[PDB]
Structure formats: structure tokens, C-alpha cells
Amino acid sequence: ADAIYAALDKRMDERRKERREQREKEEIEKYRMERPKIQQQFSDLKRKLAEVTEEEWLSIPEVGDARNKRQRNPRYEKLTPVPDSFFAKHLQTGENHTS
Amino acid sequence: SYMLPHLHNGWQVDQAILSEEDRVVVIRFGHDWDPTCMKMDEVLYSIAEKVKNFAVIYLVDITEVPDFNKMYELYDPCTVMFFFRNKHIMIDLGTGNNNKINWAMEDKQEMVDIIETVYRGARKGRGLVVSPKDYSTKYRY
Amino acid sequence: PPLSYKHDTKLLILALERLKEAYSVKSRLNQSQREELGLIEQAYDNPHE
Amino acid sequence: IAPNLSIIIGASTAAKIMGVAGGLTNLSKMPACNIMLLGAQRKTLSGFSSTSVLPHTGYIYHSDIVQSLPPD
Amino acid sequence: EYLVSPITGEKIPASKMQEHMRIGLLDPRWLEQRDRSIREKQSDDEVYAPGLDIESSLKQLAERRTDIFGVEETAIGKKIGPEEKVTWDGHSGSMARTQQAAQANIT
Amino acid sequence: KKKTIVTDVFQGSMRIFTKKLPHPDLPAEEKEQLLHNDEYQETMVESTFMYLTLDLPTAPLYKDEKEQLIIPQVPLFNILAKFNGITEKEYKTYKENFLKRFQLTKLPPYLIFCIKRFTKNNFFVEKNPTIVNFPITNVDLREYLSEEVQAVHKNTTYDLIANIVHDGKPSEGSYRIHVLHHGTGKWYELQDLQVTDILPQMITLSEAYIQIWKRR
Amino acid sequence: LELRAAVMHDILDMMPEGIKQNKARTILQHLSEAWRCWKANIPWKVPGLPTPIENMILRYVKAKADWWTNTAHYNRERIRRGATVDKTVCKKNLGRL
RNA sequence: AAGGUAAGUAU
């Protein structure tokens, strides 16, 4: 009984299924004319990988990090309060001469 | 997405949640091809190594593993869920759904904060943790 | 600027005040900021050096 | 005359350091720190910093092997 | 030649003197540090997938994203170009029926 | 008319060997049988051109190890490695790739070289700033002609007489022209109103875009 | 993301991975460093890298750099116009500019 | 229509 309703829905969709799945085909072709697929943009390079031998494949080196310990894993940057002299100096301002 | 470990059936997800006893299991339910899922998975891959001590990240394909779709309501394009000692952990994100994160997060620091908060709360025994950021608004200005 | 300049100290105090104006608003100091403040304080304590 | 030194550095730099040092004997009696400074013109910094003018630089620095290195 | 040790009080060959001083005072806490650095390294898990898993995941992703890979272009999630698994709904009242249906699905 | 004043002056004849490259995601046996099916084989097609389009190498995209930020240069003969049977160019299309090796047949008396700049990448249009290293006095194209037509064309030496150069980014750029005075042999550049006497040697140190050559 | 996935898939497909699966992750690391070396405006020349692999990595870096520049300029113009954007987007765009 | 679910032990 589910198949009956599913076929009914498909039949109702059959009104413009061919006329809208054909227009989207032309739209896809037009879009790909200007903006090709990413895989096709590397097709020639991917083809040229057939000349890399097994020893050459094994000769690929492991990537390391140039920056040293102080940059990769720096110690915790302790935050400290502003010195009391700043409160004192802000407090000195606003005290005005009487003459 | 293609770097994080993948769970291929419901039993594997069961064992992954059961196996970890001192780390929060972070599971992304979704599809590798989903753009939201690709953003979430690349953020997870970015923070995968940093949270090694207190988190393990797995990826589950809901089409391949529809075993938890009914109970966990895994019907959004992307879903991130946290478990601790075989116990689903809820997060007061402010989105109205505390049971999961069902959107892609851009910043990799926010996900680290969420995982850290979940770990703290779950190790304290809580079943709900209040996230450090309220996600009731995307803060777009 | 001569070594016996009549204003060699007033200008130094004015210069150090501008460098400390970035810290006039109270804020948590990191290592670089506190190093700069230490240098300014050392210059103020021994103006001639 | 100087096979080893011409092997290490090109004969052009070899000649330019041997002539300015006063000969092979005088260049061999010269400390290694004073050989790098042979033929170091005191280029006048024209507003630019001293580092841009590359101070304390001689034939050795401008030789082929040294110039085949990144500036840092 | 032979030399007296300023660190051990013994006679040693002259050729081994440099190495003798270099490794005669190797701080044992260096060995302890290396040991604890290797004990943690062995116990470390694999955060990322192995090469086979990465390759299989990449091929599975390519089989769906036909707007990047392949020749023909279907929708984003479609692969182009019986039995339905019974799953628990998470309710304690339906544990028994779901379990029996899982049992009843075994051939 | 077949032979107008533009055909006999600028138009030459070139031969193209268009081979269809099979899709990489195919079995090796299937690949070789498709090659045998004559669907993926060379098809010699003659054609005529008003100018020769010269593709430039891609920018280095990185600093050099020793001399950081070195201007990219390429010898002209490397650019003119096109139009011969030895070399091939994998022309990529959204449908399938093709292998199109060219072969010159008839060299026009006046040969126009159009260097390919202002290439539209996937997101915008960018100019290739590679400096073309070409001589301005004497060349020889005998190596760029097929053996059948080498006897027919006894002359293969061309002299640069006109040069176009584009200064600035493709968004907004100026077009300067260096012209060789045929009577005197001197080179003069003229940017609109401005006219200056640039030395002939300094002509080749420019980002050339269009050149005109005379076979004499 | 799509460019990285496509390049990695192509490289791993042409890779005779029956013996060298463990290089796969290494490959992605190169695809990072090259990109970083372009973003850091520093020279990138791996000595042991095979020429076809280096050529495709350079093609990937060029495509990603073109997209990067276009996206940075587009986001900057959006922000200048007054488009409503997030803080993380602003920080990333500022870094790109 | 929402962004308004305390969590935890016990049957």
C-alpha cells in the first residue's frame, strides 16, 4: 500500500519531470563551460603522477616545524596587576595650585 | 572529515562510547559530503590533536548508520554530541536544544571551550553543562 | 642635545609620561607591558643614566 | 702558487684577498677574523640603517660560495 | 697513552678520554626523563585515521560529491553518475519488541 | 577573396594534431582498446592563422632560495617550443582533455606574436608578469617547420619591428608601443602623445604582449 | 575544503598505496606547509618531493590562493558596505587583508 | 512556532 501512494506521487510529479530535469542539464553544462569541475582542473597533473616510481613515492619526506620551543609551546604568560604608582599618579592629577 | 576516525555501524558507536572512561567522546552524526558537516569536521580536525588528553573525536555516517536516528533525532544536516562514561551530556547552548550541537561552528576555540566545559561538568558528575558562550544569537553586527 | 642641557630632564619626564599613558587605564599586564614599565621606572629612577 | 685556497674559494676572490693582504705569506700570518674583513669598503649609509649597507663585509662575503646562501 | 680519571679514579686510554668525560657524568635523571618520555609515547593513541581509512573516506566522499569529482553531475548527496533495519526509538516500553525484531531478522 | 592584403601579409598556415586523451578513471585494457577504437587517435587538421598565440609559463608563486622575489623570465625559444611534433600541450576542457601538438606549414611574411596574458583563473583575471627573453636582431624558425615545407620556405629569419607592452594590472593598464624605424634602424616608443627614444637593447626588458616580425 | 579533498583524493588515487598508505597523512601535511609558505611569503622548495607531486601541489596552492584573495576582497567589500557579519569572520578577514 | 528542558541518585 505504500508503493501505491509512492507511484501516485511519482505520477503526479511526471507532469514536468522530463521538462525540468532537461533544463537543469543545460544549466549544469552552461555553468561547467565557464567554471569547470575541480577534479578536471587537476586532470593533467593527476595523469602525470603515473611517472612517479615506488622508490620515489617512498622518498617523500616528512614535514617538520621551523619554529622552536619558545614559539611552538610558550610558557604561560602570567598577568600581573598594574603597579600602585599608577593609581597614585592618577590621584595626583586633579590637585590644583591655589595660585 | 577524511582524517578523523570513522564508525561504520551502531555496535562500533556503542563500543566507542563505552570504551572511553576518562575522556569525553565527541561524535559527529552527519555525512562527509554535507557542507555544514565539512565545516564542522574541519574544525574538529583542527582541534583533534589539542584535545587528545581529554577528548576523542569520531565521525558517524547517519545514512550508513541510521541506528540512532530515531532516539537522538539525528535529522539536522550536522550534529555534534558528547558522551562521558556512557552517558549523554547536555549543553545549555541557549539554542533551545540542549541535547546536541546542530550547526557548524567557525572558530576552533569555541569548540575547545565547549569540550573543556563538558569534560569539567561530566567529571564533576553533572549531566548538564552551561556553555561559556550563549548561542541564542550569532552576534552578527 | 648637550650633556649640560637645561631641559634634559623635563623632556625625559615628558617622554616617559607619554610611554606610560598607554597604561593609564587599569588593565592586566603581560610580560612585554611590565618589561616596558620596568624600563620606564628605571629611567625615571636614574634620569642621568 | 695557492692550490688549496683556490680550491676553497674562486681564484678571483683568491687573487683579490692575496693582493690586498700583501702576499701569500702575509695572508697566512693573518688571523682568521681579519681575513673576512679584507677589502671591506666603508660604504657610507645614505640615511638607511647600517645593516642595509652590510657593514664589515669583504671579498669572502661577496665570494661565490658565500653569496650562494640566503641573506640571513 | 693512558690518563687518570678525574671523575672515576681509574686509568683509561687517551683516545676514549673525551667520550669518558662526556658519558661518565650523564645525569641519571636524563635517563629517567627519556624513560618517561618513551612510556607516554608508546601509550599514545591514534588521533587521526590510518592511510587506508583516509583513502576509503576520500573515495566515499568523492562517490557523493559529483560537483567536484566524476564526470556526470547529480545532486550534492546522490551517488548516481527489501530489508529495512529496525532501530530502537529510545523508549523503555519498546525495548522488548525492538529486541525481538532484531532477533527475528537473523536468517 | 582568398588572397587579400591581410592574408598574404599576416596569415600563415599551421597544422594541428588533435588527439583525444582518455579519461584517467578507466581500466588499462579498456584504455588501450579505446585508443584502438580510433575514437582517441590523432587527427591532422590544417588551418590558417593571422597570428601565433604563445602561452607563457606560470608564475613561480614563491620566493627564490637565494634571491628572494626574483622576476620570472623565460627565453623566447622556450615559449616557441609550441608548433612542433616533439612537444605536446594537454588542453583541458570541462568535458575531456585533448592532446593537441601543432606544426607550422607556411610562415607569413609578417609574423604577429600574441603572448597570452590576462588569463582568467577560477575567480578573476590575472596577468602573467613573466619577462620574455627574445632577441631583436636575428632568429631562425627552420627548426619550427616540418621537413616537407622546410624546402619550400627558404627564409625563416624574422626581425622584430613592432612591440606592444602592457604596464599595470589587468584592471587598469596602459599600452605602450616600441616601433623600429625601418629607414634608420632606431627604436622609438610612443605612449599616446609621449614619444621617447628607447635604446634597442632595452626593448626586450619589457612585459611584451604583441609583437610584429619581418622576414625580409 | 573541496579543493583540499579533491587534491588529496587524486594524489592518493595515483599513489601505489598497497605499500605506502602511511604517506597519505604526510601528503596533507605538505599541502599545509606549501599553503603556509605561500601565506607567509617565504620560499617553499621541498628537495625530496617528486616533480609531478610538487607541480600538483603548486597548482593546488595557486587555486587556493586565487580563491583566498577573491574571498578576502569580497568579504572586505561586504564589511565596508555594511553587511552584517560575525566577529570571527571579521578577524579572519583582517588576517587575510 | 520557538530561542523558557536544572542535573543527580532510587525503585
From Swiss-Prot, chain A:
Modified residues (Phosphothreonine): T80
Positions of post-translational Phosphoserine modification: S43
PTM section of the record: Phosphorylated by PRP4K during spliceosome assembly.
Compartments, as annotated in UniProt: Nucleus, Nucleoplasm; Nucleus speckle
Top-level taxon in the UniProt lineage: Eukaryota
Tissues in which the protein is found: Widely expressed.
Connected disease: Retinitis pigmentosa 60: A retinal dystrophy belonging to the group of pigmentary retinopathies. Retinitis pigmentosa is characterized by retinal pigment deposits visible on fundus examination and primary loss of rod photoreceptor cells followed by secondary loss of cone photoreceptors. Patients typically have night vision blindness and loss of midperipheral visual field. As their condition progresses, they lose their far peripheral visual field and eventually central vision as well.
Function per UniProt: Involved in pre-mRNA splicing as component of the U4/U6-U5 tri-snRNP complex, one of the building blocks of the spliceosome. Enhances dihydrotestosterone-induced transactivation activity of AR, as well as dexamethasone-induced transactivation activity of NR3C1, but does not affect estrogen-induced transactivation.
Protein name: Pre-mRNA-processing factor 6
Name of the gene: PRPF6
Full-protein interval shown: 101 to 199 of 941
Swiss-Prot record, chain D:
Residue numbers marked as site, Interaction with U4 snRNA and U4atac snRNA: H56
Subcellular location(s) of the protein: Nucleus; Nucleus speckle; Nucleus, Cajal body
Protein task: Involved in pre-mRNA splicing as component of the spliceosome. Required for the assembly of the U4/U5/U6 tri-snRNP complex, one of the building blocks of the spliceosome.
Record-stated family: Belongs to the PRP31 family.
Gene source species: Homo sapiens (Human)
Signal peptide residues on this chain, from the entry's feature table: none
Chain segments annotated as transmembrane: none
Post-translational modification: Phosphorylated by PRP4K during spliceosome assembly.
Subunit structure: Identified in the spliceosome B complex. Component of the U4/U6-U5 tri-snRNP complex composed of the U4, U6 and U5 snRNAs and at least PRPF3, PRPF4, PRPF6, PRPF8, PRPF31, SNRNP200, TXNL4A, SNRNP40, DDX23, CD2BP2, PPIH, SNU13, EFTUD2, SART1 and USP39. Interacts with a complex formed by SNU13 and U4 snRNA, but not with SNU13 or U4 snRNA alone. The complex formed by SNU13 and PRPF31 also binds U4atac snRNA, a characteristic component of specific, less abundant spliceosomal complexes. Interacts with PRPF6/U5 snRNP-associated 102 kDa protein.
Protein name (record): U4/U6 small nuclear ribonucleoprotein Prp31
Listed result of changing H56 to A/K: Reduces binding to the complex formed by U4 snRNA and SNU13
Domain Nop: 1-72
Expressing tissues: Ubiquitously expressed.
Chain's gene name: PRPF31
Domain statement: Interacts with the snRNP via the Nop domain.
Curated annotation (Swiss-Prot), chain E:
Positions of region (Disordered): 80-104
Compartments in which it is found: Nucleus; Nucleus speckle
Cross-link Glycyl lysine isopeptide (Lys-Gly) (interchain with G-Cter in SUMO2) per UniProt, renumbered positions: K16, K85
Modified residues (Phosphotyrosine): Y48
Positions with biased composition (Polar residues): 95-104
Regions of compositional bias (Basic and acidic residues) in chain numbering: 80-88
Tissue expression from the record: Ubiquitously expressed.
PTM annotation (Phosphoserine): residues: S5, S43, S94
Impact after mutating R97W: In a colorectal cancer sample; somatic mutation
Domain comment as written in the entry: SURP motif 2 mediates direct binding to SF3A3.
Protein role: Component of the 17S U2 SnRNP complex of the spliceosome, a large ribonucleoprotein complex that removes introns from transcribed pre-mRNAs. The 17S U2 SnRNP complex (1) directly participates in early spliceosome assembly and (2) mediates recognition of the intron branch site during pre-mRNA splicing by promoting the selection of the pre-mRNA branch-site adenosine, the nucleophile for the first step of splicing.
Assembly behavior: Component of the 17S U2 SnRNP complex, a ribonucleoprotein complex that contains small nuclear RNA (snRNA) U2 and a number of specific proteins. Part of the SF3A subcomplex of the 17S U2 SnRNP complex which is composed of three subunits; SF3A3/SAP61, SF3A2/SAP62 and SF3A1/SAP114. SF3A associates with the splicing factor SF3B and a 12S RNA unit to form the mature 17S U2 small nuclear ribonucleoprotein complex (17S U2 snRNP). SF3A1 functions as a scaffold that interacts directly with both SF3A2 and SF3A3. Identified in the spliceosome 'E' complex, a precursor of the spliceosome 'A' complex.
Protein name: Splicing factor 3A subunit 1
Organism, scientific name: Homo sapiens (Human)
UniProtKB/Swiss-Prot annotation, chain F:
Domain USP residue range list: 1-216
Domain of life where this protein originates: Eukaryota
Compartment(s) where it occurs, according to its Swiss-Prot or TrEMBL record: Nucleus
Quaternary structure annotation from Swiss-Prot or TrEMBL: The U4/U6-U5 tri-snRNP complex is a building block of the precatalytic spliceosome (spliceosome B complex). Component of the U4/U6-U5 tri-snRNP complex composed of the U4, U6 and U5 snRNAs and at least PRPF3, PRPF4, PRPF6, PRPF8, PRPF31, SNRNP200, TXNL4A, SNRNP40, SNRPB, SNRPD1, SNRPD2, SNRPD3, SNRPE, SNRPF, SNRPG, DDX23, CD2BP2, PPIH, SNU13, EFTUD2, SART1 and USP39, plus LSM2, LSM3, LSM4, LSM5, LSM6, LSM7 and LSM8.
Family under the similarity heading: Belongs to the peptidase C19 family.
Protein task: Deubiquitinating enzyme that plays a role in many cellular processes including cellular antiviral response, epithelial morphogenesis, DNA repair or B-cell development. Plays a role in pre-mRNA splicing as a component of the U4/U6-U5 tri-snRNP, one of the building blocks of the precatalytic spliceosome. Specifically regulates immunoglobulin gene rearrangement in a spliceosome-dependent manner, which involves modulating chromatin interactions at the Igh locus and therefore plays an essential role in B-cell development.
Protein name from the UniProt record: Ubiquitin carboxyl-terminal hydrolase 39
Organism: Homo sapiens (Human)
Taxonomic path: Eukaryota, Metazoa, Chordata, Craniata, Vertebrata
Gene: USP39
Full-protein positions shown: 340 to 555 of 565
